[model samples]
Target chain A: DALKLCPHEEFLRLCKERAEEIYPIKERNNRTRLALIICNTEFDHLPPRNGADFDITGMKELLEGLDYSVDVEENLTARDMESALRAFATRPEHKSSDSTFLVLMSHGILEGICGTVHDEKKPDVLLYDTIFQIFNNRNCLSLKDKPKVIIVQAARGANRGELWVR
Target chain B: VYKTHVEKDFIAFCSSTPHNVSWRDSTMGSIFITQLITCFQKYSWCCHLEEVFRKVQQSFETPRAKAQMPTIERLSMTRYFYLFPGN
Candidate 1:
Protein backbone atom coordinates (compact mmCIF):
# COMPACT_ATOMS: atom_id res chain seq x y z
CA ASP A 1 0.00 0.00 0.00
CA ALA A 2 1.22 3.49 -0.87
CA LEU A 3 1.26 6.09 1.87
CA LYS A 4 -0.78 9.22 1.21
CA LEU A 5 1.21 12.40 1.88
CA CYS A 6 -0.64 15.23 0.30
CA PRO A 7 -0.30 18.97 0.83
CA HIS A 8 -3.03 20.58 2.89
CA GLU A 9 -4.13 24.20 3.32
CA GLU A 10 -3.46 24.04 7.07
CA PHE A 11 0.16 23.13 6.45
CA LEU A 12 0.61 26.03 4.02
CA ARG A 13 -0.92 28.47 6.49
CA LEU A 14 1.39 27.32 9.29
CA CYS A 15 4.49 27.68 7.09
CA LYS A 16 3.58 31.23 6.12
CA GLU A 17 3.02 32.26 9.73
CA ARG A 18 6.36 30.84 10.72
CA ALA A 19 8.31 32.51 7.92
CA GLU A 20 7.07 35.92 9.04
CA GLU A 21 8.30 35.19 12.54
CA ILE A 22 11.89 34.72 11.37
CA TYR A 23 11.94 37.59 8.84
CA PRO A 24 12.00 40.25 11.55
CA ILE A 25 15.45 39.17 12.70
CA LYS A 26 16.91 40.54 9.48
CA GLU A 27 15.48 43.96 10.27
CA ARG A 28 16.14 44.06 14.02
CA ASN A 29 19.38 46.02 14.23
CA ASN A 30 19.77 49.13 12.13
CA ARG A 31 23.42 49.45 13.10
CA THR A 32 24.24 45.82 12.54
CA ARG A 33 27.29 45.50 10.27
CA LEU A 34 27.81 42.92 7.53
CA ALA A 35 30.63 41.94 5.15
CA LEU A 36 30.12 40.23 1.80
CA ILE A 37 33.12 38.51 0.22
CA ILE A 38 32.15 36.81 -3.02
CA CYS A 39 34.62 34.63 -4.87
CA ASN A 40 33.36 34.06 -8.40
CA THR A 41 36.17 31.63 -9.07
CA GLU A 42 33.94 29.21 -10.92
CA PHE A 43 32.79 31.91 -13.28
CA ASP A 44 36.00 33.93 -13.42
CA HIS A 45 38.37 31.10 -14.22
CA LEU A 46 36.11 29.35 -16.65
CA PRO A 47 33.58 31.23 -18.75
CA PRO A 48 30.22 29.53 -19.10
CA ARG A 49 29.35 28.47 -22.65
CA ASN A 50 25.73 29.14 -21.83
CA GLY A 51 24.45 32.64 -21.13
CA ALA A 52 23.76 31.93 -17.47
CA ASP A 53 25.51 34.21 -15.00
CA PHE A 54 26.16 34.04 -11.29
CA ASP A 55 23.49 35.95 -9.40
CA ILE A 56 26.05 37.63 -7.13
CA THR A 57 25.22 41.13 -8.33
CA GLY A 58 21.62 40.70 -7.22
CA MET A 59 22.73 39.24 -3.92
CA LYS A 60 24.97 42.25 -3.34
CA GLU A 61 22.06 44.61 -3.89
CA LEU A 62 19.87 42.63 -1.49
CA LEU A 63 22.41 42.72 1.32
CA GLU A 64 23.17 46.40 0.80
CA GLY A 65 19.49 47.31 1.05
CA LEU A 66 19.49 45.52 4.41
CA ASP A 67 21.93 48.23 5.59
CA TYR A 68 25.04 46.10 5.34
CA SER A 69 28.42 47.58 4.42
CA VAL A 70 28.86 45.22 1.51
CA ASP A 71 32.23 44.37 -0.06
CA VAL A 72 32.56 42.27 -3.17
CA GLU A 73 35.74 40.52 -4.36
CA GLU A 74 35.79 38.61 -7.63
CA ASN A 75 38.20 35.96 -9.00
CA LEU A 76 40.24 35.82 -5.82
CA THR A 77 43.30 33.64 -5.47
CA ALA A 78 43.87 31.85 -2.11
CA ARG A 79 46.22 34.61 -0.96
CA ASP A 80 43.76 37.31 -1.97
CA MET A 81 41.08 35.97 0.33
CA GLU A 82 43.39 36.19 3.35
CA SER A 83 44.30 39.78 2.53
CA ALA A 84 40.64 40.72 2.12
CA LEU A 85 39.82 39.30 5.55
CA ARG A 86 42.74 41.13 7.10
CA ALA A 87 41.65 44.39 5.50
CA PHE A 88 38.06 44.00 6.66
CA ALA A 89 39.15 43.22 10.21
CA THR A 90 41.51 46.19 10.39
CA ARG A 91 39.16 48.73 8.85
CA PRO A 92 38.60 51.49 11.43
CA GLU A 93 34.80 51.27 11.28
CA HIS A 94 34.68 47.48 11.69
CA LYS A 95 37.36 47.35 14.38
CA SER A 96 35.07 49.23 16.79
CA SER A 97 31.86 47.35 15.94
CA ASP A 98 30.27 44.23 17.43
CA SER A 99 27.89 42.60 14.92
CA THR A 100 29.73 41.20 11.90
CA PHE A 101 28.93 38.93 8.98
CA LEU A 102 31.01 37.09 6.38
CA VAL A 103 29.52 35.75 3.14
CA LEU A 104 31.39 33.49 0.74
CA MET A 105 30.05 32.53 -2.68
CA SER A 106 32.24 30.13 -4.61
CA HIS A 107 32.89 26.56 -5.67
CA GLY A 108 33.15 24.28 -2.65
CA ILE A 109 33.67 20.61 -1.89
CA LEU A 110 31.44 18.22 0.10
CA GLU A 111 33.61 18.80 3.18
CA GLY A 112 32.44 22.47 3.36
CA ILE A 113 35.63 24.06 2.10
CA CYS A 114 35.84 26.78 -0.62
CA GLY A 115 38.41 26.86 -3.37
CA THR A 116 40.86 29.62 -4.40
CA VAL A 117 42.38 30.06 -7.84
CA HIS A 118 45.85 30.87 -6.56
CA ASP A 119 48.62 28.31 -6.08
CA GLU A 120 49.95 27.13 -2.67
CA LYS A 121 52.96 29.45 -2.51
CA LYS A 122 51.04 32.58 -1.52
CA PRO A 123 50.98 33.72 2.14
CA ASP A 124 47.34 34.98 2.08
CA VAL A 125 45.50 31.89 0.84
CA LEU A 126 43.03 30.43 3.34
CA LEU A 127 40.72 27.45 3.85
CA TYR A 128 37.63 27.21 6.06
CA ASP A 129 39.77 26.39 9.12
CA THR A 130 42.22 29.14 8.35
CA ILE A 131 39.47 31.75 7.88
CA PHE A 132 37.69 30.70 11.10
CA GLN A 133 40.98 30.80 12.97
CA ILE A 134 41.50 34.39 11.83
CA PHE A 135 38.35 35.45 13.65
CA ASN A 136 39.67 33.95 16.88
CA ASN A 137 41.02 36.20 19.66
CA ARG A 138 44.70 35.61 18.94
CA ASN A 139 44.59 36.18 15.19
CA CYS A 140 42.31 38.70 13.46
CA LEU A 141 41.59 40.47 16.81
CA SER A 142 38.56 42.38 15.46
CA LEU A 143 35.76 39.83 15.32
CA LYS A 144 36.10 38.16 18.71
CA ASP A 145 32.77 37.61 20.51
CA LYS A 146 30.82 39.01 17.56
CA PRO A 147 27.82 37.43 15.89
CA LYS A 148 29.73 36.09 12.91
CA VAL A 149 27.46 34.78 10.20
CA ILE A 150 29.12 32.92 7.35
CA ILE A 151 26.91 32.13 4.35
CA VAL A 152 28.26 29.81 1.65
CA GLN A 153 26.25 29.47 -1.56
CA ALA A 154 27.90 26.92 -3.80
CA ALA A 155 27.27 23.53 -5.33
CA ARG A 156 28.99 20.56 -3.69
CA GLY A 157 29.29 18.37 -6.76
CA ALA A 158 28.01 17.57 -10.27
CA ASN A 159 25.45 15.06 -9.05
CA ARG A 160 22.10 16.59 -10.10
CA GLY A 161 20.11 13.55 -8.94
CA GLU A 162 20.62 14.53 -5.32
CA LEU A 163 18.74 17.75 -5.99
CA TRP A 164 14.96 17.77 -6.01
CA VAL A 165 13.33 18.49 -9.37
CA ARG A 166 9.75 19.77 -9.46
CA VAL B 1 42.24 49.49 22.28
CA TYR B 2 39.41 47.89 20.28
CA LYS B 3 36.69 46.30 22.37
CA THR B 4 33.89 44.05 21.12
CA HIS B 5 30.85 42.95 23.12
CA VAL B 6 29.63 39.38 23.40
CA GLU B 7 26.06 38.47 22.51
CA LYS B 8 23.95 35.58 21.23
CA ASP B 9 25.26 34.30 17.90
CA PHE B 10 23.17 32.33 15.43
CA ILE B 11 24.41 30.42 12.40
CA ALA B 12 22.00 29.42 9.61
CA PHE B 13 23.24 26.93 7.06
CA CYS B 14 21.35 26.79 3.74
CA SER B 15 21.47 23.00 3.56
CA SER B 16 20.28 20.89 6.49
CA THR B 17 22.82 18.12 5.93
CA PRO B 18 26.46 18.53 4.93
CA HIS B 19 26.73 16.06 2.08
CA ASN B 20 23.21 16.41 0.70
CA VAL B 21 22.54 18.45 -2.44
CA SER B 22 20.20 21.41 -2.02
CA TRP B 23 17.46 22.01 -4.62
CA ARG B 24 16.30 25.17 -6.36
CA ASP B 25 13.39 25.75 -8.73
CA SER B 26 14.74 27.50 -11.83
CA THR B 27 11.57 29.55 -12.15
CA MET B 28 11.70 30.89 -8.56
CA GLY B 29 15.27 30.28 -7.29
CA SER B 30 16.36 28.58 -4.04
CA ILE B 31 13.35 26.84 -2.49
CA PHE B 32 14.25 27.79 1.06
CA ILE B 33 14.89 31.43 0.29
CA THR B 34 11.87 31.77 -2.01
CA GLN B 35 9.39 30.26 0.45
CA LEU B 36 11.01 32.29 3.20
CA ILE B 37 10.44 35.53 1.31
CA THR B 38 6.86 34.55 0.56
CA CYS B 39 6.13 33.84 4.19
CA PHE B 40 7.73 37.10 5.26
CA GLN B 41 5.64 39.19 2.86
CA LYS B 42 2.31 37.45 3.53
CA TYR B 43 2.11 37.09 7.31
CA SER B 44 1.92 40.25 9.41
CA TRP B 45 1.16 38.47 12.69
CA CYS B 46 3.00 35.37 13.93
CA CYS B 47 4.25 33.39 16.92
CA HIS B 48 7.88 32.68 17.87
CA LEU B 49 11.13 32.11 15.94
CA GLU B 50 11.18 28.37 16.54
CA GLU B 51 7.62 28.10 15.25
CA VAL B 52 8.54 30.07 12.20
CA PHE B 53 11.67 28.02 11.45
CA ARG B 54 9.80 24.80 12.10
CA LYS B 55 7.07 25.75 9.66
CA VAL B 56 9.54 26.71 6.97
CA GLN B 57 11.50 23.55 7.57
CA GLN B 58 8.38 21.43 7.30
CA SER B 59 7.26 23.18 4.13
CA PHE B 60 10.54 22.43 2.44
CA GLU B 61 10.79 18.90 3.85
CA THR B 62 7.39 17.68 2.62
CA PRO B 63 7.63 18.83 -1.00
CA ARG B 64 11.33 18.06 -0.99
CA ALA B 65 10.68 14.45 -0.01
CA LYS B 66 8.87 13.84 -3.28
CA ALA B 67 12.11 14.73 -5.06
CA GLN B 68 14.89 14.91 -2.46
CA MET B 69 14.91 15.04 1.31
CA PRO B 70 15.99 18.39 2.80
CA THR B 71 17.67 18.84 6.15
CA ILE B 72 18.49 21.76 8.53
CA GLU B 73 21.12 22.04 11.25
CA ARG B 74 20.71 24.49 14.11
CA LEU B 75 24.03 25.39 15.76
CA SER B 76 22.69 28.04 18.05
CA MET B 77 24.38 29.64 21.03
CA THR B 78 21.21 29.68 23.12
CA ARG B 79 18.39 27.22 23.77
CA TYR B 80 16.11 29.10 21.34
CA PHE B 81 16.24 32.32 19.34
CA TYR B 82 13.48 34.87 19.85
CA LEU B 83 12.72 36.98 16.76
CA PHE B 84 12.31 40.26 18.60
CA PRO B 85 15.96 41.16 19.28
CA GLY B 86 17.07 42.82 22.54
CA ASN B 87 13.92 41.50 24.18
Candidate 2:
Protein backbone atom coordinates (compact mmCIF):
# COMPACT_ATOMS: atom_id res chain seq x y z
CA ASP A 1 0.00 0.00 0.00
CA ALA A 2 1.14 3.53 -0.67
CA LEU A 3 1.28 6.21 2.01
CA LYS A 4 0.47 9.84 1.65
CA LEU A 5 3.66 11.73 0.90
CA CYS A 6 2.27 15.24 0.60
CA PRO A 7 -0.67 16.77 2.37
CA HIS A 8 -3.17 18.91 0.48
CA GLU A 9 -1.92 22.12 2.01
CA GLU A 10 1.71 21.37 1.13
CA PHE A 11 0.65 20.36 -2.35
CA LEU A 12 -1.07 23.68 -2.82
CA ARG A 13 2.16 25.38 -1.84
CA LEU A 14 4.17 23.25 -4.25
CA CYS A 15 1.79 24.14 -7.06
CA LYS A 16 2.63 27.76 -6.54
CA GLU A 17 6.38 27.13 -6.31
CA ARG A 18 6.32 25.10 -9.52
CA ALA A 19 3.52 26.80 -11.38
CA GLU A 20 5.00 26.22 -14.83
CA GLU A 21 5.56 22.51 -14.24
CA ILE A 22 2.23 21.73 -12.64
CA TYR A 23 -1.31 21.64 -13.96
CA PRO A 24 -3.21 23.88 -11.60
CA ILE A 25 -6.47 22.82 -10.08
CA LYS A 26 -9.32 25.31 -9.83
CA GLU A 27 -11.01 26.15 -6.55
CA ARG A 28 -13.45 23.48 -5.42
CA ASN A 29 -16.51 25.68 -5.87
CA ASN A 30 -15.69 26.51 -9.48
CA ARG A 31 -14.42 23.13 -10.63
CA THR A 32 -16.21 20.64 -12.78
CA ARG A 33 -14.60 17.22 -12.90
CA LEU A 34 -15.91 15.01 -15.67
CA ALA A 35 -15.04 11.42 -16.57
CA LEU A 36 -16.13 8.62 -18.92
CA ILE A 37 -16.06 4.89 -18.25
CA ILE A 38 -16.73 2.37 -21.04
CA CYS A 39 -16.62 -1.30 -20.19
CA ASN A 40 -17.45 -4.07 -22.66
CA THR A 41 -18.54 -6.82 -20.31
CA GLU A 42 -20.84 -8.89 -22.49
CA PHE A 43 -20.38 -9.47 -26.19
CA ASP A 44 -22.49 -10.87 -28.97
CA HIS A 45 -19.78 -13.22 -30.25
CA LEU A 46 -17.03 -12.82 -27.67
CA PRO A 47 -16.45 -14.21 -24.22
CA PRO A 48 -17.89 -12.10 -21.45
CA ARG A 49 -15.56 -10.16 -19.22
CA ASN A 50 -16.51 -12.06 -16.07
CA GLY A 51 -15.20 -9.74 -13.40
CA ALA A 52 -15.63 -6.47 -15.20
CA ASP A 53 -18.40 -5.45 -12.84
CA PHE A 54 -15.88 -5.19 -10.04
CA ASP A 55 -13.74 -2.93 -12.16
CA ILE A 56 -16.66 -0.65 -12.98
CA THR A 57 -17.80 -0.64 -9.40
CA GLY A 58 -14.39 0.32 -8.06
CA MET A 59 -13.64 2.85 -10.76
CA LYS A 60 -17.00 4.57 -10.54
CA GLU A 61 -16.64 4.90 -6.81
CA LEU A 62 -13.14 6.30 -7.13
CA LEU A 63 -14.06 8.95 -9.68
CA GLU A 64 -17.24 9.91 -7.93
CA GLY A 65 -15.48 10.28 -4.64
CA LEU A 66 -13.10 12.65 -6.39
CA ASP A 67 -16.14 14.77 -7.34
CA TYR A 68 -16.24 13.87 -11.05
CA SER A 69 -19.62 13.45 -12.66
CA VAL A 70 -18.94 10.23 -14.57
CA ASP A 71 -20.72 8.94 -17.67
CA VAL A 72 -20.66 5.19 -18.05
CA GLU A 73 -21.58 2.85 -20.94
CA GLU A 74 -21.38 -0.90 -20.90
CA ASN A 75 -21.03 -3.39 -23.79
CA LEU A 76 -20.79 -0.96 -26.69
CA THR A 77 -19.64 -1.83 -30.17
CA ALA A 78 -16.52 -0.21 -31.60
CA ARG A 79 -18.51 2.35 -33.54
CA ASP A 80 -20.70 3.14 -30.58
CA MET A 81 -17.70 3.55 -28.33
CA GLU A 82 -16.25 6.06 -30.74
CA SER A 83 -19.55 7.86 -30.93
CA ALA A 84 -19.75 8.06 -27.17
CA LEU A 85 -16.29 9.54 -26.91
CA ARG A 86 -16.96 12.04 -29.67
CA ALA A 87 -20.01 13.31 -27.85
CA PHE A 88 -18.21 13.36 -24.52
CA ALA A 89 -15.41 15.48 -25.96
CA THR A 90 -17.87 18.21 -26.73
CA ARG A 91 -19.66 18.39 -23.39
CA PRO A 92 -20.03 21.95 -22.03
CA GLU A 93 -18.92 20.69 -18.61
CA HIS A 94 -15.38 20.37 -19.94
CA LYS A 95 -15.06 24.14 -20.13
CA SER A 96 -14.85 24.32 -16.36
CA SER A 97 -12.75 21.17 -15.88
CA ASP A 98 -9.04 21.12 -15.26
CA SER A 99 -8.59 17.46 -16.26
CA THR A 100 -10.56 14.43 -17.38
CA PHE A 101 -10.41 10.65 -17.26
CA LEU A 102 -11.36 8.14 -19.96
CA VAL A 103 -11.35 4.49 -18.97
CA LEU A 104 -11.89 1.67 -21.52
CA MET A 105 -12.05 -1.94 -20.43
CA SER A 106 -12.65 -4.56 -23.11
CA HIS A 107 -11.35 -7.44 -25.13
CA GLY A 108 -8.72 -6.29 -27.59
CA ILE A 109 -7.02 -7.23 -30.82
CA LEU A 110 -3.41 -6.48 -31.69
CA GLU A 111 -4.61 -3.61 -33.82
CA GLY A 112 -6.88 -2.13 -31.17
CA ILE A 113 -9.92 -2.81 -28.94
CA CYS A 114 -12.42 -5.45 -30.03
CA GLY A 115 -16.02 -4.71 -30.82
CA THR A 116 -18.76 -6.97 -29.49
CA VAL A 117 -18.83 -9.05 -32.65
CA HIS A 118 -15.09 -9.29 -33.21
CA ASP A 119 -13.65 -12.67 -34.09
CA GLU A 120 -10.50 -14.28 -35.53
CA LYS A 121 -11.29 -13.83 -39.23
CA LYS A 122 -13.61 -10.83 -39.07
CA PRO A 123 -12.09 -8.40 -36.59
CA ASP A 124 -14.44 -5.73 -35.29
CA VAL A 125 -11.96 -3.23 -33.97
CA LEU A 126 -11.65 0.27 -32.61
CA LEU A 127 -8.29 1.69 -33.62
CA TYR A 128 -6.56 3.34 -30.67
CA ASP A 129 -5.48 6.30 -32.75
CA THR A 130 -9.08 7.32 -33.32
CA ILE A 131 -9.34 8.25 -29.65
CA PHE A 132 -6.62 10.87 -29.96
CA GLN A 133 -8.23 12.35 -33.05
CA ILE A 134 -11.58 12.63 -31.35
CA PHE A 135 -10.05 14.59 -28.49
CA ASN A 136 -7.46 16.58 -30.38
CA ASN A 137 -7.03 20.30 -29.72
CA ARG A 138 -8.97 21.31 -32.82
CA ASN A 139 -11.81 18.95 -31.98
CA CYS A 140 -12.15 19.47 -28.23
CA LEU A 141 -11.35 23.15 -27.81
CA SER A 142 -12.50 23.37 -24.20
CA LEU A 143 -10.08 20.63 -23.16
CA LYS A 144 -7.09 21.91 -25.11
CA ASP A 145 -4.60 22.48 -22.31
CA LYS A 146 -6.16 20.16 -19.78
CA PRO A 147 -4.83 16.79 -18.73
CA LYS A 148 -6.44 13.80 -20.45
CA VAL A 149 -5.82 10.72 -18.33
CA ILE A 150 -6.70 7.54 -20.18
CA ILE A 151 -6.64 3.98 -18.86
CA VAL A 152 -6.94 1.03 -21.27
CA GLN A 153 -7.43 -2.42 -19.75
CA ALA A 154 -7.32 -5.15 -22.41
CA ALA A 155 -4.94 -7.73 -23.75
CA ARG A 156 -3.12 -6.45 -26.79
CA GLY A 157 -2.66 -9.88 -28.32
CA ALA A 158 -3.73 -13.51 -27.98
CA ASN A 159 -0.19 -14.94 -28.04
CA ARG A 160 3.39 -13.89 -28.48
CA GLY A 161 4.56 -13.35 -32.07
CA GLU A 162 7.80 -11.38 -31.94
CA LEU A 163 10.93 -11.32 -29.84
CA TRP A 164 11.80 -7.62 -30.40
CA VAL A 165 9.22 -6.18 -32.73
CA ARG A 166 8.11 -2.77 -31.55
CA VAL B 1 6.03 31.86 -27.84
CA TYR B 2 3.07 29.54 -28.43
CA LYS B 3 2.47 27.53 -31.61
CA THR B 4 -0.37 25.35 -32.86
CA HIS B 5 -0.20 21.75 -31.77
CA VAL B 6 -2.52 18.85 -32.43
CA GLU B 7 -2.34 16.88 -29.17
CA LYS B 8 -0.98 17.67 -25.75
CA ASP B 9 -1.29 16.98 -22.03
CA PHE B 10 -2.41 13.37 -22.60
CA ILE B 11 -1.17 10.27 -20.80
CA ALA B 12 -2.29 6.70 -21.34
CA PHE B 13 -1.80 3.58 -19.27
CA CYS B 14 -2.01 0.56 -21.54
CA SER B 15 -2.46 -2.78 -19.77
CA SER B 16 0.26 -4.56 -21.68
CA THR B 17 3.14 -3.70 -23.90
CA PRO B 18 2.47 -3.88 -27.65
CA HIS B 19 3.01 -7.62 -28.15
CA ASN B 20 2.03 -9.08 -24.78
CA VAL B 21 -1.29 -10.31 -23.44
CA SER B 22 -2.84 -8.82 -20.33
CA TRP B 23 -4.22 -11.11 -17.65
CA ARG B 24 -7.70 -10.93 -16.14
CA ASP B 25 -9.15 -13.01 -13.31
CA SER B 26 -12.70 -14.24 -13.54
CA THR B 27 -13.39 -13.39 -9.93
CA MET B 28 -11.09 -10.47 -9.21
CA GLY B 29 -10.96 -8.62 -12.54
CA SER B 30 -7.94 -7.59 -14.58
CA ILE B 31 -4.60 -7.67 -12.79
CA PHE B 32 -3.64 -4.31 -14.24
CA ILE B 33 -6.91 -2.64 -13.39
CA THR B 34 -7.04 -4.21 -9.98
CA GLN B 35 -3.56 -3.07 -9.10
CA LEU B 36 -4.38 0.31 -10.58
CA ILE B 37 -7.39 0.80 -8.34
CA THR B 38 -5.42 -0.30 -5.32
CA CYS B 39 -2.63 2.16 -5.95
CA PHE B 40 -4.83 5.07 -6.89
CA GLN B 41 -7.07 4.52 -3.94
CA LYS B 42 -4.07 4.78 -1.70
CA TYR B 43 -1.98 7.45 -3.40
CA SER B 44 -4.02 9.68 -5.73
CA TRP B 45 -4.86 11.92 -2.85
CA CYS B 46 -1.24 13.01 -2.36
CA CYS B 47 0.82 11.90 -5.34
CA HIS B 48 0.83 12.66 -9.04
CA LEU B 49 -0.60 10.20 -11.56
CA GLU B 50 2.87 9.19 -12.76
CA GLU B 51 3.88 8.08 -9.30
CA VAL B 52 0.78 5.94 -8.93
CA PHE B 53 1.57 4.27 -12.27
CA ARG B 54 5.11 3.55 -11.11
CA LYS B 55 3.81 1.66 -8.08
CA VAL B 56 1.60 -0.43 -10.35
CA GLN B 57 4.57 -1.27 -12.53
CA GLN B 58 6.60 -2.25 -9.50
CA SER B 59 4.00 -4.74 -8.32
CA PHE B 60 4.67 -6.87 -11.42
CA GLU B 61 8.42 -6.98 -11.07
CA THR B 62 8.39 -10.52 -9.67
CA PRO B 63 8.40 -13.45 -12.13
CA ARG B 64 5.09 -14.95 -13.15
CA ALA B 65 3.55 -17.68 -15.32
CA LYS B 66 2.88 -15.27 -18.17
CA ALA B 67 5.13 -12.29 -18.15
CA GLN B 68 3.24 -9.03 -18.52
CA MET B 69 4.56 -5.51 -18.48
CA PRO B 70 2.14 -2.63 -18.35
CA THR B 71 3.25 0.50 -20.14
CA ILE B 72 2.80 4.22 -19.72
CA GLU B 73 2.33 5.05 -23.38
CA ARG B 74 1.57 8.03 -25.59
CA LEU B 75 2.52 10.51 -22.85
CA SER B 76 2.82 14.09 -24.03
CA MET B 77 2.15 15.93 -20.84
CA THR B 78 4.15 19.10 -20.11
CA ARG B 79 3.10 19.31 -16.48
CA TYR B 80 2.37 17.13 -13.49
CA PHE B 81 -1.16 15.74 -12.90
CA TYR B 82 -2.74 15.29 -9.51
CA LEU B 83 -6.16 13.83 -8.94
CA PHE B 84 -6.45 15.84 -5.72
CA PRO B 85 -8.91 13.33 -4.35
CA GLY B 86 -11.72 14.75 -2.22
CA ASN B 87 -10.61 18.25 -2.99
**Candidate closest to the true structure, highest lDDT:** 2
TM-scores for all candidates: the values are 0.58, 0.92
* Model 1 chain A: worst 10 consecutive residues (lDDT sum): A45-54
| Interface RMSD measured for model 1 | 10.7
Please give the distance, in angstroms, between residue B79's alpha carbon in candidate 1 and its true position after superposition. 8.0
Model 2 ranges off by over 4 Å: A1-6, A160-166
Worst 10 residues of 1 chain B by lDDT: B78-87
Question: What are the per-residue Cα lDDT tens digits for candidate 2 across A20-117?
Answer: 88898877798888999999998887778899998898788777877788989988888998999999999999999888999999998667888887
User: Which ranges in model 1 have alpha carbons more than 4 Å from their true place?
Assistant: A1-32, A41-54, A116-126, A157-166, B1-16, B23-56, B63-87
What DockQ was computed for model 1?
Answer: 0.17
Recovered native contacts, candidate 2? 0.73
Give me the TM-scores for chain A across all models, comma-separated: 0.60, 0.89
